[PDB]
Amino acid sequence: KQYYFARRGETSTHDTSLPPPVKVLSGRSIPLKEIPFETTRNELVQIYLTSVDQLIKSNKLNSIPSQQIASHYLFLRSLANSETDGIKKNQILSLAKPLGIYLASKEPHVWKTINELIEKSEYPIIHYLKNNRAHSNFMLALIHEYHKEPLTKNQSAFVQKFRDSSVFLFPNPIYTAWLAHSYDEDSSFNPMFRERLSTNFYHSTLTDNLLLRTEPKEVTLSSEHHYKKEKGPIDSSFRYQMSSDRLLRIQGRTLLFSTPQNDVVAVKVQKRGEPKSTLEEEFQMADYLLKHQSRLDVYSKLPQPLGQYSVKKSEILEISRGSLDFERFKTLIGDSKDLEVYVYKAPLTYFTYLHDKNQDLEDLTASVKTNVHDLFVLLREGIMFPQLADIFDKGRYQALVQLLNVLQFQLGRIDKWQKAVEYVNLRSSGLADLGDSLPITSLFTSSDFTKHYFSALLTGGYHPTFFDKSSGTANSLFTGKRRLFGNYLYLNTIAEYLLVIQLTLGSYGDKVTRDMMDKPKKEAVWRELANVMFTSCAEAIHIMTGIPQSRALTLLKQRANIEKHFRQTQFWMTPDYSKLDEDTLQMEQYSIYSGEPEYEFTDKLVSGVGLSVDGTHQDLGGYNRESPLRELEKLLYATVTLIEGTMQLDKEFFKQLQQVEKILSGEIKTDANSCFEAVAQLLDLARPRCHFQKRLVLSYYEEAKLKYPSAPTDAYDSRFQVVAKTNAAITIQRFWRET
Amino acid sequence: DQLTEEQIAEFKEAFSLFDKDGDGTITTKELGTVMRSLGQNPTEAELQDMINEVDADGNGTIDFPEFLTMMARKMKDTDSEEEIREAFRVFDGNGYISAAELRHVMTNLGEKLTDEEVDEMIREANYEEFVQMM
Amino acid sequence: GFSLYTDDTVKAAAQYAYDNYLGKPYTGSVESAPANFGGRMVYRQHHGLSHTLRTMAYAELIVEEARKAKLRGETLGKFKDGRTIADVTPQELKKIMIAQAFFVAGRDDEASDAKNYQKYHEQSRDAFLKYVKDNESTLIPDVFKDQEDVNFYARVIEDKSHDWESTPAHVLINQGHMVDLVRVKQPPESFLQRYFSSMQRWIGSQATEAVFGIQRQFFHATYEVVAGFDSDNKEPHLVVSGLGRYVIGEDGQPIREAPKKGQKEGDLKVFPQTYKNERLMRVDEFLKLPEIQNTFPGSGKHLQGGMPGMNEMDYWNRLNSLNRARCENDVDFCLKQLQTAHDKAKIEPIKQAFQSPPTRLFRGLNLSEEFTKGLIDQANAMIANTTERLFTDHSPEAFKQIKLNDLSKMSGRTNASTTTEIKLVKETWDSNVIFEMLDPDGLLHSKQVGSEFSVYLPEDVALVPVKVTLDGKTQKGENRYVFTFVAVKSPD
Ligand SMILES: [Ca+2]
Ligand SMILES: [Mg+2]
């Protein structure tokens, strides 16, 4: 009954029929060469191991901070336990032994904690870095200090882009585990290394380094999907007796009409500039969605179409006279004595936009839940909407601009942000104007959409420093995204959906807090809106990855602070901040940002509006500056990184479960310790606070004990004993709350 | 009734995990794996009963509502005093150890409970004796 | 590269001190009234969070002009072995600052009985040890060395003895906690004399003057009433050493004794007691004493005693405003206020010396290591004359130093390739020498290019260094000295 006609899978690459990776500059054709990720990372790890060896043989071991040596030793143990070769693992452990001796000798307490970590997880360095030691790049510090042989341009570029932390040289399972665990409750990780002049944010570098690791997705649509199954033309087997006695209004280019059954019949005329194809695609898409309402579990009250045909322009012009904005609608319609009309029936609330200020906050929460649920279900199906709100790289606003460009560091100024979501395609009852949808494959191929809007991503990245004078090519880690651009545009689509949700809620707040005076009431409205936005991000994660909603919300609130998002939405989305002078503005920014540098601008404020370029509509951010809403951007990156990191972690978990099962069935006859290491890794690669994965790993550990009886379980009794205790507790609470 | 909602969330999480293709339907090739991951480890014949009688459509895959129906059917057999006894005798050491330990583990392992809930449980109660008083 | 305002641990240390002791009410029944600023309530109005934060900032400032003076090449004090305050390693400063957060965490009330004083400091030491042992994993390996050092700082906090002049960790805590209590001590010149003499012995006249002036700025930024300096006040002087006064010997001089190998000795201390013509010493009488007015530069100088501006009524409005109770109940806000006050006190002396488009303009370039050393030498030699003067105006010396040593003027009379993003200089050339440009008021033709900008410095606009900084190492493995300049509308 319930299932999605699209399925995810792996591919060789997306680099089929893209623009050739050549940049044209005043008669020079510069070829753009990628820097492979998974190979430069491995070369850096090898240089790290060699430099650790040179450290140990240099006896300068006493000239390193004790926590830094602890990090070195823990990383060496974890990396060793990630390797499979006997020679490499033995080499890594023979490297880590002298550091272990040094720790247990000089700093007994540090070692007392380190052994606690080692017996608690198989990759200890990921439990040792859920704090502000992750900003300390021990790897690169050592490589710079002791490996004196200069790095090649590939390693140099990798270091330069990823100098932020040291979790950027981890192998895929260790890094994915660390990224997923950084959101766990007991983690104090905040991707912000605030030193005395910088405040380096790298919440986007985590996502970039995660994407550069994944293998290119492709979504395969079923044969009977809406964009694969094809149906014939639509017959005008029903003509609406269109009568001016029942018109209610003109919504943009749509005539409304009453119904004695309390429903509303709308007629959308052919908008000027586009053909009948758009109206028929809207008709067919609406009919398809209404046909598969039960399967999709879509919530929107969807517009049941009745027909699509043509009527004479005279009739439309003659019925429209009794309106308010007749002239504007007359200018919106096309110039032709006959025009194309699409007729649908929708509930009355289908036309009051989501951000209409005449609905109480509870109804706003319900409608936002409906719209986010429906957006992301239809994204799972493979139907993306690229024009929910005309937020106008070719003019489009990229919600994840850092991933999709070379040397773009913060989000962009949402010019006329309240204008953008004025006629948004999100309505109080659900979604609307389903016509301009786009099958998901249009991100994983070189469609006209992808070629037009994201040309920079597909053509590779250029900058005058990327140019190697010797080889005459631009060697860039960004160009590698050519193979992977489908994942980047997928995440950008999710971030766009949530950005439009945020701007709609913000427009609602701006429109409601004009008519309210008691400041506690205004801040209560804005706090409820911040709650709704965070809950919508949690709903996106729950729908896209299966993580329960509460756990996803907790994993978000660990990352994007809700109170600062409150304060920034309440501050930069109302004209009230335009009244204040310079110093009062300064002190209010000290409160909204609260631990991170303020939004600094030089442009002049127009009274009663705020920041602007025209002088009569409000911007979200000064001209040619970034968006002042940090915690919104942190929320977007937290959401997309949670989704992609959960997917990659689950890929790794299955890649390890296959290796475990090939042992328990004898297909790889090895020692007992090999199987025990396999099960330990399979335990460490489970989602944070995801119990059933740990229960499965415990079952596999019991089976491995049964197959290898005489094996020592001394090093694996602790964590699995804890897992058994937790499972017993789980069933105890189940029985206890049953009654 | 149906079942506790917190089991519905866990079922949905596990089902969406073991769906390698992200389509909302699982093939029986790893239905056993998800079932053992939910405290249900049946032999290939016991589950083969359902591989026979599971798929109403017949396509060879299980949709999520059918999966919930499967779990509701299979939750009326294993849930008994056996699991409760196994949970009781997994801490330490003569059938009556302590209640402070139980109150401690109820607040940090698994979905944590409140101090008031632990106090109510302690006043309700001797592991064997307290287990059979509910 | 380390400071108070961006630490995330000292910040959390002060956060813990506010959450457990500084934000908890007085319980001693001696001046225990929680003041009410606006709608908000402050428990420790005298010795609350603002006091701790000002003390930490004083520690940083004292050590900062200590190393400043060391760069100037004058003579500092000695801690029983060749070394001075300027020789404080940054992690030692971090240790001192974590110690200072709890130095007042045990004050049940303002009462200063010696036994009660000792009890309060014992409670403060116990609270400090309880905190460190609670976050022991993150502090003993890296911040401190061993539990013995934590015990040493606990000893310094509790301070069973009174040998504050023993180790730098002693001075930068006791002097810092002592000089903060100038805002409340009613006879101003006596206390300021005592503190100025007690701290100049460590550093020097100019740096102590700078410390006190920036202390006034800290007071302003934290909404604390600033005491006026009255060099000719007729109030009777009291010696801050203990609590006594100076009675005159009825003719023109106080009670003066005589040591061996000396004809005359300084003033003799007596308790406030019966006079008669045995009058006391007035403050004006105390200041113009030739034996003391040759070392205290403030003799004969006066200060505003308030913001040079808005009147007494508006000033009183500001003092009782909400932000006064916000600095008392928010570590983040008070730290931000102090940081901006420090930046202004760091760049305002430059404007003081020289009478008078985005703000920050990073401009990176690659330079040889020997040239970077020879440039940092001659840029620190220009930073180490910009002490924020309070009594003695030394504008000509720093102006001549800036004018004659125009070796850091190799960025004007030409175009530029600037931007306004740190990473965009790290991410393109990853230069080993960044030139951050601070210019809040015009003075730069910061025309956009298109993102990034491109500046042009006129002849009548100079650049003056502010704080040379070393920021890690480049991609190719060499240090990245990120300088910082300020733009001066210099008609000269
Ligand atoms: Ca499937
Ligand atoms: Mg712009």
The DSSP annotation for A602-642 comes to -SPPBTTTBS-SSSSS--BS-TTSB-S-HHHHHHHHHHHHH
**What is the number of other CB atoms lying within 10 angstroms of the CB of residue A435?**
21
**Which one-letter amino acid corresponds to residue C488?**
V
What approach was used to elucidate this structure?
cryo-EM
Gap between the Cα atoms of B104 and B119, Å rounded: 11
By the 8 A CB rule, do C75 and C66 touch? no
Are the C-beta atoms of A184 and A131 separated by less than 8 Å?
no
Q: Are A686 and A697 in contact (CB under 8 A)?
A: yes
d(CA A337, CA A701): 76
What is the largest distance, in Å, between two alpha-carbon atoms of chain C?
84
Chain A to chain C, count of Cβ pairs less than 8 Å apart? 87
The first and second tokens of residue A351, run together, are 């036309």
Pairing of strands C479-488, C433-438: parallel
CATH 1.10.238.10 fits B81-131, yes or no: yes
Provide the phi-psi class of C305: left if phi over 0, else alpha when psi is between -120 and 50, else beta: left
User: Which residues sit opposite C37 in a β-bridge?
Assistant: C40
Enumerate long-range contacts of A580-589, CB under 8 Å, 24 or more apart: A586/C340, A587/C323
User: Do the two chains B and C touch, given a threshold of 8 Å on CB pairs and at least 3 pairs?
Assistant: no
Residue A22's nearest CA partner among A476, A443, A473, A406 is A473
Number of Cβ within a 10 Å radius of residue C133: 12
Cβ contact B134–A736 (<8 Å) = yes
Three-state secondary structure call for residue A701? helix
Residues in CB range of A561: below 8 A, 6 or more apart: A631, A634
- Which token pair is A226? 């809406």
Least Cα distance to A459 among A152, A161, A25 occurs for A25
CA–CA min distance B91, chain A (Å) = 7
Q: Which chains touch C (3 or more CB pairs under 8 A)?
A: A
Interface size A-B, in CB pairs within 8 Å, comes to 100
Residue A731 is nearest to which of B63, B65, B87, comparing CB atoms? B87
Strands C447-449 and A430-431: unpaired
Residues by chain with Cβ below 5 Å of ion ligand 1: B 21, 23, 25
Tokens, residue C427:
């991410």
| Interface-testing mutation among C2, C5, C6, with chain A (most A C-beta atoms within 10 A) | C6
What CA–CA distances, in Å, run from A739 to A735, B126, B134, C172?
A: 7, 20, 8, 63
CA distances to A54, A88, A210, A607 from A46, in Å? 12, 11, 20, 60
Check if A199 contacts B (Cβ < 8 Å).
no
The residues facing A25 across adjacent strands are A28
- The dihedrals phi and psi of A305, each to the nearest 5 degrees, come to -75, 155
Contact B4 A734 (CB under 8 A): yes
Resolution in A: 3.7
CB–CB of B21 and A7 under 8 A?
Answer: yes
Among the partner-chain residues A107, A156, A465, the one whose CB lies closest to the CB of C428 is: A465
Ligand nearest to the CA of A4: 1
Report the distance separating Cα A594 and Cα C329, nearest Å. 13
The closest alpha carbon to C330, from A592, A635, A628, belongs to A592
Q: Distance (Å, rounded) from C-alpha C124 to C-alpha A98?
A: 41
Q: Which residues are registered as beta bridge partners of C463?
A: C487
Using a CB-CB distance cutoff of 8 angstroms, which residues of chain A are in contact with residue B25? 3
Distance from C-alpha of A389 to C-alpha of A367, rounded to nearest angstrom = 17
Q: Which domains are seen in chain C, by residue range? A: 10-228+305-341 (1.10.3210), 354-488 (no CATH)
Phi–psi pair at B62, nearest 5 degrees: -115, 125
The reply to whether residue B64 touches residue A2, judged by beta carbons under 8 angstroms, is yes
C340 contacts in A (CB within 8 Å)?
Answer: 586
CA separation for the pair A209, A500 (Å, rounded): 26
Residues across chain A: 739
CB A433 within 8 A of CB A425: yes
Helix axes A481-512, A361-381, angle to 10 degrees: 160
Checking DSSP bridges between strand A28-34 and strand A473-476, what pairing results, if any?
Answer: parallel
Neighbours of chain B (3+ CB pairs under 8 A): A
With vertex at residue A586, the alpha carbon angle to CA A583 and CA A589, rounded to the nearest 5 degrees, is: 155
Q: Report the distance separating Cα A379 and Cα A219, nearest Å.
A: 11
- Give the integer Cα–Cα distance in Å for C344 and C217: 9
Amino acid at site A229: K
User: Are chains B and A touching, using the cut-off of 8 Å on CB pairs and a minimum of 3 such pairs?
Assistant: yes
* Gap between the Cα atoms of A487 and A495, Å rounded: 12
Q: Which helix (H) or strand (E) holds A221?
A: strand A217-221
Structural element, H or E, at residue A103? helix A86-106
Beta-bridge partners for A220? A7
Which of C57, C108, C84, C121 has its CA nearest to residue C343? C57
Interface residue ranges in chain C relative to chain A, Cβ cutoff 8 Å = 1-3, 5-6, 8, 136-138, 140-142, 323, 332-333, 336-337, 340, 357-360, 421-424, 426-430, 436, 448, 450-451, 469, 471-473, 475-477, 482, 484
Could you tell me which of A643, A444, A482 has the C-alpha nearest to residue A556? A643
CA of A622 to the centre of ligand 2 (A): 9
Is residue A281 within 8 A of residue A305, CB to CB? The reply is no
Rg of chain B (C-alpha set) = 18
**Does the annotation list B25 as a binding residue?**
yes
DSSP code per residue over B25-67: EEETTTHHHHHHTTT----HHHHHHHHHSS-SS-SSEEEHHHH
Handedness of CA A277, A282, A287, A289 (dihedral sign): positive
What's the CA gap between A174 and A210, in Å, rounded?
A: 12
Give me the sign of the Cα torsion angle A445, A447, A450, A456: positive
* Contact: B23, A6; criterion CB under 8 Å: yes
Q: In chain A, count of helices (H) and strands (E)? A: 26, 17
Distance CA C464, CA C402 (A): 8
DSSP A10-75: E-S-S-SSPPPSEEEETTEEEEEEE--HHHHHHHHHHHHHHHHHHHHHHTGGGGS-HHHHHHHHHH
3-state helix, strand, coil in chain B (%, to 5): 50, 5, 45
CA distance A663 to B62: 28
How far is the C-alpha of C63 from the C-alpha of C176, rounded, in Å? 11
Residue of C398, C352, C403, C380 whose CA lies nearest to C465: C380
Q: State the span(s) of chain B assigned CATH 1.10.238.10.
A: 5-74, 81-131
Q: Would you say A433 is a known binding-site residue? A: yes
Nearest CA in chain A to C438: A197
CB environment A43-76: b (16+ within 10 A), e (fewer)? bbbebbbebbeebbeeeebeebebbbbbbbbbbb
- Nearest CA to A679 out of A698, A666, A692, A665 is that of A698
- Please tell me the distance in Å from B11's CA to the nearest CA on chain A: 9
Per the CB < 8 A criterion, the answer to whether C289 and C189 are in contact is no
- The highest-level CATH class for domain B5-74 is mainly alpha
Distance CA C61, CA A173 (A): 47
Q: Which of A436, A422, A490, A479 is nearest to A456 (CA)?
A: A479
Minimum Cα–Cα distance from A218: chain B residue = B21
Residue of B nearest to A541 (CA): B13
How far the first Cα of chain B sits from its last, in Å, is: 19
CA gap B28, B14 in Å, rounded: 14
- HSE toward the beta carbon, residue A435, CA cutoff 13 A: 19
Burial B47-77 (b: 16+ CB within 10 A, else e): beebeeebbeeeeebbbbebbbebbeebeee
| Of residues A150, A197, A463, nearest to C428 (C-beta) | A463
| Helix or strand (DSSP H, E) at A142 | helix A138-145
The CB density around residue A523, as the number of other CB atoms within 10 Å, is: 14
Whether C63 and C88 have beta carbons less than 8 Å apart is answered as: yes
Residue pointed to by tokens 């939910």: B38
- Distance, in Å, from the CA atom of A354 to the CA atom of A139, rounded to the nearest integer, reads 50
Residues of C in contact with A624 (CB under 8 A): 448, 450-451
Q: In sequence order, which residues have a C-beta less than 8 Å from that of residue A663 and are 6 or more positions away?
A: A670, A674, A675, A678, A704
Name, in order, each residue with C-beta under 8 angstroms of A601's C-beta and a sequence gap of 6 or more. A611, A621, A622, A625
Read off φ and ψ for residue C77, nearest 5 degrees.
-85, 175
CA A221, CA B22: separation in Å to the nearest integer?
12
Residue A114: closest C-alpha in chain C: C137
Q: Which residues pair with A475 in a beta bridge?
A: A33
Task: Spell A591-611 as b/e; 16+ CB within 10 A means b.
Answer: bbbbbbebbebeeebbeeebb
| Residue whose token pair is 């509303």 | A264
Half-sphere exposure of A240 (CA within 13 A, CB side): 30
Q: Are strands A438-439 and A338-346 parallel, antiparallel or unpaired?
A: unpaired
CA–centroid distance, B21 to ligand 1, in Å, is: 5
Does an H or E element contain A296, and which?
helix A293-296
Rounded to the nearest 5°, which phi and psi values hold at A162? -115, 40
b/e map C168-192, b = 16+ CB within 10 Å: bbbbbbbbbbbbbebbeeebbbbbb
A597 touching C (Cβ < 8 Å): no
- CA C261, C266, C271 angle in degrees (round to 5)? 130
Q: Are C84 and C72 in contact (CB under 8 A)?
A: no
What separation in Å is there between the alpha carbon of B34 and the centre of ligand 1?
13
